[PDB]
Amino acid sequence: STGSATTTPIDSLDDAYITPVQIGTPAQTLNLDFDTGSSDLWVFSSETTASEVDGQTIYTPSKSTTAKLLSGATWSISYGDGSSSSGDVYTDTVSVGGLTVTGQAVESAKKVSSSFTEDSTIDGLLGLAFSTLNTVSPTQQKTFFDNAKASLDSPVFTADLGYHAPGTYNFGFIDTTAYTGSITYTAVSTKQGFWEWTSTGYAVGSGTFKSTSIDGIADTGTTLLYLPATVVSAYWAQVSGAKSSSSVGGYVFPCSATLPSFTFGVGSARIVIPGDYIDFGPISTGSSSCFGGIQSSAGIGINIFGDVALKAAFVVFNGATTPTLGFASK
Template sequence: MKVPKAVTVGQGKLNLDLDTGSGDLWVFSTETPKDQSQGHNLYMPTSKSKRLDGYSWEITYGDMSSAGGDVFLDTVSIGNVTASSQAVESAKKVSDQFAKDKATDGLMGLSFSILNTVEPKSQTTFLDTVLKQLEKPLFTCNLKHGQPGSYDFGYIDDSKHTGEIAYTNVDNGQGWWGFTAESYSIGGGSNSTHSFHGSQHRGAPGSSIDGIADTGTTLMLLSDDVVQEYYGQVQGAKNDEQQGGWVFPCDARLPDFTLSISGYNAVVPGKFMNYQSVGSVCFGGLQSVGSSGGVPNIFGDVFLKSQFVVWDTEGPRIGFAPQA
């Protein structure tokens, strides 16, 4: 489940989704139309807030949800980390998906700042704004399956993971936390389909899978051939157009899914692949990214909840270890 983080924006607390797949910090505010903002906590610009005259923003996400508005500079704090002059994007319009999601009052983008949509001059993400004051130029996430997880900025809490952290290089050329898994396997031991193997996925050589680590995407979205291979191991699984993806009997045995990343095997337990029940069947946590060009494979929350993850801007690099 997605559990938004309480963030102090200006004078008030808002529940924001921390999203490593985008670069905008935007909020429901007193400028948001009442029929869209009902039930949400609102950002209230004060005399201490500085409006950036002539600046605007508009963002559309992968699921086609969207928002847009104007821009203030204000104080933003998570825990004991404070940005004193952070671009806060005030929503003057939001799509239905956001209006109906009463648990969330906006998003905090934690991608690289190149993805920020503010015009005429893009603004820095919260992470880039506070980077110099952090002990280390990184943050970590320890997301959990079926319970609240945690984020830490500027340090690594070694009590939250076991073993060494395995790092791999990040390709941030497009602003995302992109990395390559050298190979993958389905199942384990004698049930494993092929240990590590592969054909080419999304233009990567050999058996590798290129993708982005994205806390803002709930599911794991990979290429058709990988997804079909996985559900080929699940009795009764089918791609159901009505449900919008792969479904299976709720009591089906789901194999583990393992990604090999710089020699480290990141295992997603099979039970994580049961995302939710829809009627008499269950909807899979692994789905197809689709065939539209330019959409990367996405290692979303289903994958990230299986790992302790370090997002290090130096390098940049991303690190994985088993959760404690």
């Protein structure tokens, strides 16, 4: 089998992407944030504290003839941005782009943190990291991809995120029309539960490529590119007036600037992030200070190849017995 679904930016900055997901019988369609940095499929639901729902579409398991409470199971998650959510668990039928999994754990939120409430466009998350990170207790549950893997034509999914435009998540096949050149594959460590890999270096604008190993994760659920302080300083030094602002919480730059591209290495190959992809706009409405899309990871503990990096590529998440990642230009 295969599936294919369009993913759409939630706003004009590409802060996140939503993909429609059919849950239950009859289908309840929710728009979920596919997140290769986490491993829970959780949704706003009829069980969510009413004051914490503000415009999201909810899953109502009592209206699904295929829903079944997973007795005794609870979940609770905290993300790298400080947000969190928790609740109980049902199993139900879940379909993405024509690919159906029966018995998928659907984690129903009883509580969500304020940042989820405040974003009416995201009805939940669909985790695509390794199932070892799933938070369901006392019996850890499998991701949608893990459950679908054996049925897929090939045990892969691909992320093709758009810049200010829709893109595509495919399951079970490589669309060879969706990228240019060849796909360069690189080794993955699953020891931390992430799609963790080592970039071979970077360049700033038209500058010389610096060969240096940068370990990080491919994370569709993180907006920005978080890299070591040395790398980030080298980038922003090429932007007149850019500075790190403790009050704002990162590098800012004059909105009148033209940003240089940023290149990262995948083996001997190179993925070029255009400068415009690094502009995240005014820090507050009407400001002429703009927020940078490349930020230091020094306070995170891991480097993160978020959407800024991934949307410059066609990305293959190869879930073979030994997983690998593939990147192509597009």
